Short mmCIF file of C-alpha atoms in Angstrom, two decimals:
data_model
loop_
_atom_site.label_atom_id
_atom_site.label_comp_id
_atom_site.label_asym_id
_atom_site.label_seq_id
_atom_site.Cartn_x
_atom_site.Cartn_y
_atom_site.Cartn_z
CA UNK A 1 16.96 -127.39 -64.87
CA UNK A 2 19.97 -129.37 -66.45
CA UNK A 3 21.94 -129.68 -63.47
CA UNK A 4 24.98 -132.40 -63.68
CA UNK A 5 27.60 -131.87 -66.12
CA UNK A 6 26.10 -134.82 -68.65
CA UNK A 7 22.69 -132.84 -68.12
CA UNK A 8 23.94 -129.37 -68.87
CA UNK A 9 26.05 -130.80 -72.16
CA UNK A 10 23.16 -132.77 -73.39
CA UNK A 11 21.44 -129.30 -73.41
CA UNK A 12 23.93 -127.47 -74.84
CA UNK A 13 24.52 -130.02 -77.64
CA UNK A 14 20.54 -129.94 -78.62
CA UNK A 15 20.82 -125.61 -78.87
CA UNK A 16 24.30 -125.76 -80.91
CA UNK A 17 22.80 -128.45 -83.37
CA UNK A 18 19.60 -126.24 -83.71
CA UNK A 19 22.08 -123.32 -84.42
CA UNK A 20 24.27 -125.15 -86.75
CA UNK A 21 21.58 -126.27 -88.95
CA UNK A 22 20.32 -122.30 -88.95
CA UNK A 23 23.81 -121.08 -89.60
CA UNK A 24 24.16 -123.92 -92.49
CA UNK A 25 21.60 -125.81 -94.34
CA UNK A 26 18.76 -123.68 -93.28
CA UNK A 27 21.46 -120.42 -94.05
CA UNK A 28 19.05 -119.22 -96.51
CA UNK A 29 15.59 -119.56 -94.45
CA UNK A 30 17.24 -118.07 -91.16
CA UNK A 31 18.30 -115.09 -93.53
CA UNK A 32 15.11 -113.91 -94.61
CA UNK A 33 13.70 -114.75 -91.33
CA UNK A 34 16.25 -111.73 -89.92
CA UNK A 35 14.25 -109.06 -91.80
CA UNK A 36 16.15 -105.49 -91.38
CA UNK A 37 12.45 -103.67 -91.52
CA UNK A 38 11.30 -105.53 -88.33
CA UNK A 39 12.13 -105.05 -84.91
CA UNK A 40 15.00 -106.22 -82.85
CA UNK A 41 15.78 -110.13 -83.52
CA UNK A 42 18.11 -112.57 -81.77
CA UNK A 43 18.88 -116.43 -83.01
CA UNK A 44 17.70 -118.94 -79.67
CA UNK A 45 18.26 -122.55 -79.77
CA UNK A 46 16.41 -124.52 -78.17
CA UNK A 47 16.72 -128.22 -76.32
CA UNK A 48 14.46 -129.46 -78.83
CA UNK A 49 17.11 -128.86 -81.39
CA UNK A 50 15.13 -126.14 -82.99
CA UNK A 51 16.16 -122.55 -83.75
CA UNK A 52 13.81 -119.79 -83.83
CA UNK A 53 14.15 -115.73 -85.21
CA UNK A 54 12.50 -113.71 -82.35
CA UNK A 55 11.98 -110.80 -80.73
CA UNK A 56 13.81 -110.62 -77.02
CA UNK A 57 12.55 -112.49 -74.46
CA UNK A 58 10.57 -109.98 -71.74
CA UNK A 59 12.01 -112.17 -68.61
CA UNK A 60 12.51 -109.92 -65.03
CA UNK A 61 14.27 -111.29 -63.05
CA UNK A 62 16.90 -112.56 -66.16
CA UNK A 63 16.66 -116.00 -66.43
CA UNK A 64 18.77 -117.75 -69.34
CA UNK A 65 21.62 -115.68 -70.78
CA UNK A 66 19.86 -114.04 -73.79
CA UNK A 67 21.26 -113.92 -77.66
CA UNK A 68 22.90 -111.00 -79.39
CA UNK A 69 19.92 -108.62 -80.02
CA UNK A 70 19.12 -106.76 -83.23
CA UNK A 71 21.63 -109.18 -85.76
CA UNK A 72 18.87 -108.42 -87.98
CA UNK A 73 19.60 -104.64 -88.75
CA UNK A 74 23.01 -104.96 -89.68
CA UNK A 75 22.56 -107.64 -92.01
CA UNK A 76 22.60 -105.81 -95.26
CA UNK A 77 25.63 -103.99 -94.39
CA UNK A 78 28.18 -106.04 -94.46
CA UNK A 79 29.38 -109.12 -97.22
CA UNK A 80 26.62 -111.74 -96.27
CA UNK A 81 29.97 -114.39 -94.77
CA UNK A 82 30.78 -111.22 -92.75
CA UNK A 83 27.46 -111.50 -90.97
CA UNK A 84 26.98 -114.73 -90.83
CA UNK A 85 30.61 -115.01 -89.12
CA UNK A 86 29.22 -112.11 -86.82
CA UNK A 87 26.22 -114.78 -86.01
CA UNK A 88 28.26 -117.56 -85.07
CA UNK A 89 30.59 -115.70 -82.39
CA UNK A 90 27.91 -114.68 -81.10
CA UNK A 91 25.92 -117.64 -80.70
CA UNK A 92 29.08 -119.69 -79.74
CA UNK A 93 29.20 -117.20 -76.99
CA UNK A 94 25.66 -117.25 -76.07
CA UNK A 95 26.06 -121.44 -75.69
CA UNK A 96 28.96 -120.93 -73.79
CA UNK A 97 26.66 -118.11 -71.17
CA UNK A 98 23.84 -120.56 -70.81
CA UNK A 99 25.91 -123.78 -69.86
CA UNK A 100 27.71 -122.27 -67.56
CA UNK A 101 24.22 -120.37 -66.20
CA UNK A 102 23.03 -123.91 -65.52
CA UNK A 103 26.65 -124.42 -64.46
CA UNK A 104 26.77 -122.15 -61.53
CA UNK A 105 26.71 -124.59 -58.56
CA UNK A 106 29.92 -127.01 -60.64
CA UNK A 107 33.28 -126.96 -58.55
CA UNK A 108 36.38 -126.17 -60.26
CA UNK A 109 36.92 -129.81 -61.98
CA UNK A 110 33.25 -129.90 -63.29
CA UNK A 111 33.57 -126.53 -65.06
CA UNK A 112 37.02 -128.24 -66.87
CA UNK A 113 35.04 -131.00 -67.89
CA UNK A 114 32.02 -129.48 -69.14
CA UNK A 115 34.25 -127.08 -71.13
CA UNK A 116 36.02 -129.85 -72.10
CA UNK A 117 33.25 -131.14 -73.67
CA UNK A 118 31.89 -128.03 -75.55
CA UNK A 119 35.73 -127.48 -76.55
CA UNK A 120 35.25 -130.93 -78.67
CA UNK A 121 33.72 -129.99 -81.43
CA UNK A 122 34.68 -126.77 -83.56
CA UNK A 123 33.02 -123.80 -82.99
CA UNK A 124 30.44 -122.49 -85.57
CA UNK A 125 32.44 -119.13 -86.26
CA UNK A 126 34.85 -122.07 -87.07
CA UNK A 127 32.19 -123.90 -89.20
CA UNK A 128 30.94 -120.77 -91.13
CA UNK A 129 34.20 -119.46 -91.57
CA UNK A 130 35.60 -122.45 -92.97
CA UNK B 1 40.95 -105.98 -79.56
CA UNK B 2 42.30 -108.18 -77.12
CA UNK B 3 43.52 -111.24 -79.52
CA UNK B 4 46.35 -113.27 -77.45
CA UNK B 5 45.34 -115.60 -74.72
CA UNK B 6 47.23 -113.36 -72.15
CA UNK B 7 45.64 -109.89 -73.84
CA UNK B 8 42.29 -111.78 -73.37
CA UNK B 9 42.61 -113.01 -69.93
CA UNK B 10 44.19 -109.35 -69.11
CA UNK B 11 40.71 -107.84 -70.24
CA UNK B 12 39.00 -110.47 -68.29
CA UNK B 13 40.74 -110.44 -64.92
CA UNK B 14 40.13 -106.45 -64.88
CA UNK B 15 36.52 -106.75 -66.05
CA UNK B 16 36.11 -108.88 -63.18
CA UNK B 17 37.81 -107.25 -60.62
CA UNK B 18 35.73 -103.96 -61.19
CA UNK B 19 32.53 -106.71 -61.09
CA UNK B 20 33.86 -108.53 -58.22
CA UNK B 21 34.09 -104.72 -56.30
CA UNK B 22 30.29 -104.11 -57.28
CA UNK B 23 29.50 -107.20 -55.37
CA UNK B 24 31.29 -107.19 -52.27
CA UNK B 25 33.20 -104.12 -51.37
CA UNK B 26 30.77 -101.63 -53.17
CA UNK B 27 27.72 -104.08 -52.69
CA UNK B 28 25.57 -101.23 -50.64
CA UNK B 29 26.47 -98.49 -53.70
CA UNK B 30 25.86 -101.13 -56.47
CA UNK B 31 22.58 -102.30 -54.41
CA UNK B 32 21.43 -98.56 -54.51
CA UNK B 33 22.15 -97.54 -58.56
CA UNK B 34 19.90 -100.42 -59.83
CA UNK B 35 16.81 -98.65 -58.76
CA UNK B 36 13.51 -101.06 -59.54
CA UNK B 37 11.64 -97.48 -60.77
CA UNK B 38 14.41 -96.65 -63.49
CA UNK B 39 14.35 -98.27 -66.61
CA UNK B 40 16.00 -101.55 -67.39
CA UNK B 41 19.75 -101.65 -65.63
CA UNK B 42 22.94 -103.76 -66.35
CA UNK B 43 26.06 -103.76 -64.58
CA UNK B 44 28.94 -103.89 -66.72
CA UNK B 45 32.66 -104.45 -65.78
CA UNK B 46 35.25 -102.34 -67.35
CA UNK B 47 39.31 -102.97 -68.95
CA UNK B 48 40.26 -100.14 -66.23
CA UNK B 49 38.60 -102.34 -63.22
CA UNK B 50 35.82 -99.92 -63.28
CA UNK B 51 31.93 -100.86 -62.56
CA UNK B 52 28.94 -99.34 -64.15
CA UNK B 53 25.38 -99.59 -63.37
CA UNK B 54 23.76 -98.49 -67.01
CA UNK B 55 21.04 -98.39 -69.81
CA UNK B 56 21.86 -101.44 -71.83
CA UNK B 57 23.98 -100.42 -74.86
CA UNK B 58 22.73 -99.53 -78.15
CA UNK B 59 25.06 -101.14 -80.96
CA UNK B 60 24.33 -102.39 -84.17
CA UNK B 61 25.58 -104.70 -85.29
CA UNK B 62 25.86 -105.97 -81.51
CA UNK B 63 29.96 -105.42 -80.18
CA UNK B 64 30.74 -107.17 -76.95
CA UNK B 65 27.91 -109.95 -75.60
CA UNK B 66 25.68 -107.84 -73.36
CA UNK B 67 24.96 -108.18 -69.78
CA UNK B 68 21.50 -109.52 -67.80
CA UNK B 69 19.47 -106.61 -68.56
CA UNK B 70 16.84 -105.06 -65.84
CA UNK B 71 18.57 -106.54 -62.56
CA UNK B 72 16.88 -103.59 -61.20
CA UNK B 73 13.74 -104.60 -61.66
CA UNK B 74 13.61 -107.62 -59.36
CA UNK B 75 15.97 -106.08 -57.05
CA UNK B 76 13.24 -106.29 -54.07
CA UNK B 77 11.09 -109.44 -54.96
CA UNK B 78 13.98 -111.67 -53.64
CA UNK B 79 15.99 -111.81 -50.68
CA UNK B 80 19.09 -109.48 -50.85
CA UNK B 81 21.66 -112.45 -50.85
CA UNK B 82 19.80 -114.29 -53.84
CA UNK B 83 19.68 -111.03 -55.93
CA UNK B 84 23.04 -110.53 -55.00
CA UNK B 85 23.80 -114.37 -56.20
CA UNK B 86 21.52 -113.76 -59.58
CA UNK B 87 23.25 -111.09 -60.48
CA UNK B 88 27.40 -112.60 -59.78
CA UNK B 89 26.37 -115.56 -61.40
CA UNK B 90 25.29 -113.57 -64.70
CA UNK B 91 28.00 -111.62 -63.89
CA UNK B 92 30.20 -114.91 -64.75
CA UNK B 93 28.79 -115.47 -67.77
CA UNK B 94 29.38 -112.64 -69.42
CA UNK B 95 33.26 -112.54 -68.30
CA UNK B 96 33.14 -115.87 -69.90
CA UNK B 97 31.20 -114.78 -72.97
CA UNK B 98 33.35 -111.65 -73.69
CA UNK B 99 36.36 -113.71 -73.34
CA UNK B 100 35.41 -116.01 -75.94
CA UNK B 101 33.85 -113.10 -77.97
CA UNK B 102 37.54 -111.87 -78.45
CA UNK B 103 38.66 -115.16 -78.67
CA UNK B 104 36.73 -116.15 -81.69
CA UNK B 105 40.17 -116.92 -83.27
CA UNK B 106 42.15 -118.95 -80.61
CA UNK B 107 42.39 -122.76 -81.91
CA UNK B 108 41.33 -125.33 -79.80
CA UNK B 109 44.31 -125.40 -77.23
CA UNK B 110 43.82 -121.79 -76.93
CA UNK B 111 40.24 -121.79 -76.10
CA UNK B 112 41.83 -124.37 -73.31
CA UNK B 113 44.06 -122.26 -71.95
CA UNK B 114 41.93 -119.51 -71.58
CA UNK B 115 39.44 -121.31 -69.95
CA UNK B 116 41.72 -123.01 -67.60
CA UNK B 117 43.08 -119.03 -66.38
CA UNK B 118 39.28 -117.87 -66.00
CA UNK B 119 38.62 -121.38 -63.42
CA UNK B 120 41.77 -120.61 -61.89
CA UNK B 121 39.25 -118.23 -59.64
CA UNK B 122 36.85 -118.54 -57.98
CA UNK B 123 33.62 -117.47 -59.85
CA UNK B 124 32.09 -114.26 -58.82
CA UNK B 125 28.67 -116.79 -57.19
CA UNK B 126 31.00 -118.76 -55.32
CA UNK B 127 32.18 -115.53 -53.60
CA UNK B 128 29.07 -113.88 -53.18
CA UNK B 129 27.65 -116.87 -51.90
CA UNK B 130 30.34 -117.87 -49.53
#
């Protein structure tokens, strides 16, 4: 749906703060949340600025880019910044896939400006890593 | 293991160019792998410019950002050329999110540069869809 670059940053911005906060001052709820018992998990953000622990979305055809799947069973096995870091690639990359999903019909100056844009504020790998 | 801008956009340009092969040249061989009866199907482009129609991979905790997962299964519910423009444009994203998976370390003029070598083509849609 977000269709114009302003549209498809607004969107982007409301999933990375929903992420951020998961990733930071909810660190500790979003933990527990990936339980290494339960099935596969993934971080989403949504537009609504909220960030949800889930199960893989069951979507044919694909629709939106989906999360890094399963960050819940390695989470015990590695330093606890290790997997956090791990997180925050992945759901800087995962940002990154959906904009530029929404992005598909952009020509070549409206892809520099939207990743302009997203390239504005520091990445959360950058965040969580410090 | 790519970590320089060039050593990313080397991985990225031959990733692509095994994708970009699926999609045009190979489109009738590609078409025919991702079988709607077989189980869920990616295609996945390779460092040696080799395409791969496969089960999605099984890695914990998750390597490289994964690609759309069962394109097969909605291979016939569309019209060939918007199947064929589902999959290049999810094809795009994932160049874009591996890229930025190995670049999790670039700084910010970095993550610039690399982005301004992957727009420097055109994107695997805007081929596919002429």
């Amino acid at each position: 749906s977000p269709r114009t670059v302003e549209e498809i940053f607004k969107d982007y911005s409301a999933r990375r703060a929903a992420l951020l906060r998961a990733l930071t001052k909810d660190v500790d709820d979003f933990y527990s949340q990936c339980d290494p018992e339960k099935e596969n998990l993934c971080l989403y953000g949504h537009p609504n600025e909220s960030w949800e622990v889930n199960l893989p979305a069951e979507e044919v055809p694909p629709e939106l880019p989906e999360p890094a799947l399963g960050i819940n069973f390695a989470r015990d096995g590695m330093q606890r910044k290790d997997w956090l870091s791990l997180v925050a690639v992945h759901s800087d990359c995962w940002l990154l896939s959906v904009s530029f999903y929404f992005g598909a019909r952009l020509n070549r100056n409206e892809r520099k400006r939207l990743f302009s844009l997203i390239n504005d504020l520091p990445t959360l790998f950058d965040v969580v890593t410090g």
